[PDB]
Amino acid sequence: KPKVVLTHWVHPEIIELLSASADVIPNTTRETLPRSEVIARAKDADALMAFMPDSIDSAFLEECPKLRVIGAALKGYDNFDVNACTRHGVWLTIVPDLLTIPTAELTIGLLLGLTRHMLEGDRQIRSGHFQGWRPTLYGSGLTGKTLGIRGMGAVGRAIAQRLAGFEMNLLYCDEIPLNAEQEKAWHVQRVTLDELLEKCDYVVPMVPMAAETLHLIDATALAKMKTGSYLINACRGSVVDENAVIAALASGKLAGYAADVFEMEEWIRADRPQAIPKALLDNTAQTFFTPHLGSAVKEVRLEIERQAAMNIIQALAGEKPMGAINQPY
Amino acid sequence: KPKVVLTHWVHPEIIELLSASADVIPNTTRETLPRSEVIARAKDADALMAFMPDSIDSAFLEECPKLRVIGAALKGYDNFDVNACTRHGVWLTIVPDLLTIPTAELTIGLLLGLTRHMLEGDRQIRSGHFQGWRPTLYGSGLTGKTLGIRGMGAVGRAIAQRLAGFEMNLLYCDEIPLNAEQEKAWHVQRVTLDELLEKCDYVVPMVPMAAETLHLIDATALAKMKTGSYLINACRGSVVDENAVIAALASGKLAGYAADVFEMEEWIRADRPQAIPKALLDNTAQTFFTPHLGSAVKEVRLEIERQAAMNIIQALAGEKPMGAINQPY
Numbered sequence: 335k336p337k338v339v340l341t342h343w344v345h346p347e348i349i350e351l352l353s354a355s356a357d358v359i360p361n362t363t364r365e366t367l368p369r370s371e372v373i374a375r376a377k378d379a380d381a382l383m384a385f386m387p388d389s390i391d392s393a394f395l396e397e398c399p400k401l402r403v404i405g406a407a408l409k410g411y412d413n414f415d416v417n418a419c420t421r422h423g424v425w426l427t428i429v430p431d432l433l434t435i436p437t438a439e440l441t442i443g444l445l446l447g448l449t450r451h452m453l454e455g456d457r458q459i460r461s462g463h464f465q466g467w468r469p470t471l472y473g474s475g476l477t478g479k480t481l482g483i484r485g486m487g488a489v490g491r492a493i494a495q496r497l498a499g500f501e502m503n504l505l506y507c508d509e510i511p512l513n514a515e516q517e518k519a520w521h522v523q524r525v526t527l528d529e530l531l532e533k534c535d536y537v538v539p540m541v542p543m544a545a546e547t548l549h550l551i552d553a554t555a556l557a558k559m560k561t562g563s564y565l566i567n568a569c570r571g572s573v574v575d576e577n578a579v580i581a582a583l584a585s586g587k588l589a590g591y592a593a594d595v596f597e598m599e600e601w602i603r604a605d606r607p608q609a610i611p612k613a614l615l616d617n618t619a620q621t622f623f624t625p626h627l628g629s630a631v632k633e634v635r636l637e638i639e640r641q642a643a644m645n646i647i648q649a650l651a652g653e654k655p656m657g658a659i660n661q662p663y
Numbered sequence: 664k665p666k667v668v669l670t671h672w673v674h675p676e677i678i679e680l681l682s683a684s685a686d687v688i689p690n691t692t693r694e695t696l697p698r699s700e701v702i703a704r705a706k707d708a709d710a711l712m713a714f715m716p717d718s719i720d721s722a723f724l725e726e727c728p729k730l731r732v733i734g735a736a737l738k739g740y741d742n743f744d745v746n747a748c749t750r751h752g753v754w755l756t757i758v759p760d761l762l763t764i765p766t767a768e769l770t771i772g773l774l775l776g777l778t779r780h781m782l783e784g785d786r787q788i789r790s791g792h793f794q795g796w797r798p799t800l801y802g803s804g805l806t807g808k809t810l811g812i813r814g815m816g817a818v819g820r821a822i823a824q825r826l827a828g829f830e831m832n833l834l835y836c837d838e839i840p841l842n843a844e845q846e847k848a849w850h851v852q853r854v855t856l857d858e859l860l861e862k863c864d865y866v867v868p869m870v871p872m873a874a875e876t877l878h879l880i881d882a883t884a885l886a887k888m889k890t891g892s893y894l895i896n897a898c899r900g901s902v903v904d905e906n907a908v909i910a911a912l913a914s915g916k917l918a919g920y921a922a923d924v925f926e927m928e929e930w931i932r933a934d935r936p937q938a939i940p941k942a943l944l945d946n947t948a949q950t951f952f953t954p955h956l957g958s959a960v961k962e963v964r965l966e967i968e969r970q971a972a973m974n975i976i977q978a979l980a981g982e983k984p985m986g987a988i989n990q991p992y
């Protein structure tokens with residue numbers, strides 16, 4: 335039977351699904367193996383299930399000459415050398431984009447946790463000093479306040495659909511406008527970016543991959559927005575300028591920053607740090623963060639895993655995998 | 664089985680990749696088909712891969728009623744009526760990032776080729792009279808001189824990073840500034856366009872197509888440039904006034920002009936010429952030209968065609984294409 339190496343943890347029903355026809359080497363832990371260990375297990379693997387920390391280049395593929403398919407549990411492939419996979423006879427497949435809705439829900443969670451001081455409220459309960467209502471942790475409400483979504487892709491649309499019930503004044507800017515039926519269903523008004531920043535209490539950058547500009551919010555955009563406003567970032571790491579956020583945090587220009595993504599995360603940008611700034615990390619008062627949980631819901635992660643596994647089973651049986659992005663040999 | 668028309672030549676792997684789920688009609692030649700023949704092949708097609716010479720308007724779409732998706736192998740879609748496509752129920756997809764780096768590389772090659780008289784040097788050697796060094800073709804060197812970037816977007820940033828090792832004095836002019844640690848990393852300096860035009864030995868416009876700042880480098884703009892400057896145009900062919908340039912070269916204020924783009928190819932404006940002004944075509948000593956080769960790297964064109972193909976495969980299967988700027992129903 336063929337051998338499939340899985341670089342990260344999958345749910346056990348996926349293991350049993352692959353084990354009908356392949357010999358499965360699981361990563362039993364929640365950790366990322368080092369490159370030296372991955373190549374060691376896949377030295378003689380017929381298939382490899384790859385995830386976001388994986389990095390497939392010609393050096394990797396030369397050390398794995400038995401490989402016939404790489405099944406990516408990812409919706410894109412920026413970290414693979416696709417043409418090298420082809421040159422070496424390796425199918426390279428992806429899965430559809432299933433992240434849109436769980437990321438809009440977590441963006442909103444981020445919004446509420448930050449503006450309602452829910453972390454420091456949890457900390458005070460986890461002490462012992464709680465003895466009832468107190469005039470503290472007076473936060474900031476959504477109702478009647480104005481919120482702006484910089485981008486209006488599928489995920490920005492997913493937020494607006496969900497914020498619709500919150501009696502807010504939702505502004506959006508985007509080069510292409512929503513259908514007028516969507517604008518009336520979600521009471522969301524289209525404006526410029528000068529307007530959006532000037533007038534918003536909450537700014538959420540949320541642009542589809544197609545409309546890409548790095549550092550979309552910098553100190554230049556921070557100065558333009560309302561004083562004491564809040565910024566929430568779960569789009570991508572490059573979209574926010576972290577050092578300029580820290581500046582507005584200090585000058586009272588920002589009362590809060592929340593983020594599920596960071597610029598350090600990425601390695602295709604040359605100006606990459608590789609730790610999260612200590613300035614945002616010590617400020618537990620004005621910040622709320624989570625470790626790229628944007629898609630960390632079980633139903634979604636399971637469906638992403640099944641589809642890469644199906645991709646893998648299909649290629650091994652000598653079929654064209656439904657998810658191919660290349661045609662090898 | 665749905666059908667997909669490709670208006671220009673693609674790599675055979677792309678054809679094989681589209682074939683899994685559609686019947687493919689390729690342009691088997693390296694030439695642009697005329698509008699009529701393109702419409703003839705698409706009339707009953709479910710998908711179209713458009714390149715830069717293609718021009719989709721309402722009339723095109725009405726000829727092609729079965730159309731579900733246009734996969735443009737482009738970043739700039741100045742030639743696609745996004746609204747009409749939406750009205751007709753047609754996904755419009757673009758390809759966001761792959762052209763930035765190949766274009767910076769060519770701009771820098773244009774700079775070296777022009778300042779070093781490298782074209783003339785090749786002529787002088789193919790003529791067979793080379794019998795050693797002579798005191799001729801003395802050019803302008805890069806180290807110690809000032810270069811200015813009008814437009815510090817994606818491409819302008821890729822140029823400055825590549826040029827920071829050439830011991831130059833880099834200036835830039837742009838509405839959005841660079842942040843503090845990027846200005847330090849490349850020792851770029853923000854200035855006004857008038858400063859730029861005044862203290863620059865080389866000027867590189869890198870700005871998108873605009874209403875005005877169309878013809879941004881014009882007789883008035885030249886008029887404040889240093890005597891003996893050089894101008895390298897690799898953005899859109901209409902950002903420079905090509906006839907103001909012809910005058911600048913004969914009068915001695917421009918020591919040369921290199922372009923990869925020409926006013927002639929812009930059909931978006933009625934003020935469209937139909938040839939490159941032959942005054943420039945004959946000045947072989949002061950010019951350097953390439954036929955829109957900014958992204959003519961073979962490996963990049965593959966990934967650009969791959970991205971456009973994937974959008975089509977996604978749309979035809981029912982997903983949302985990863986590069987969609989559109990949303991029909």
Ligand SMILES: NC(=O)c1ccc[n+]([C@H]2O[C@@H](COP(=O)(O)OP(=O)(O)OC[C@@H]3O[C@H](n4ccc(N)nc4=O)[C@H](O)[C@@H]3O)[C@@H](O)[C@H]2O)c1
Nearest residue numbers: 762766814815816817818837838839869870897898957958
């Ligand atoms: N030869 C080729 O084959 C080829 C290949 C790729 C691209 N292209 C061309 O198509 C464009 C996209 O280039 P870009 O660099 O990708 O675009 P972008 O980031 O949007 O633009 C920079 C912006 O300049 C701005 N700006 C804007 C208006 C204004 N009044 N003042 C400003 O200052 C603004 O602030 C921003 O920084 C050209 O640049 C050029 O390269 C040619």
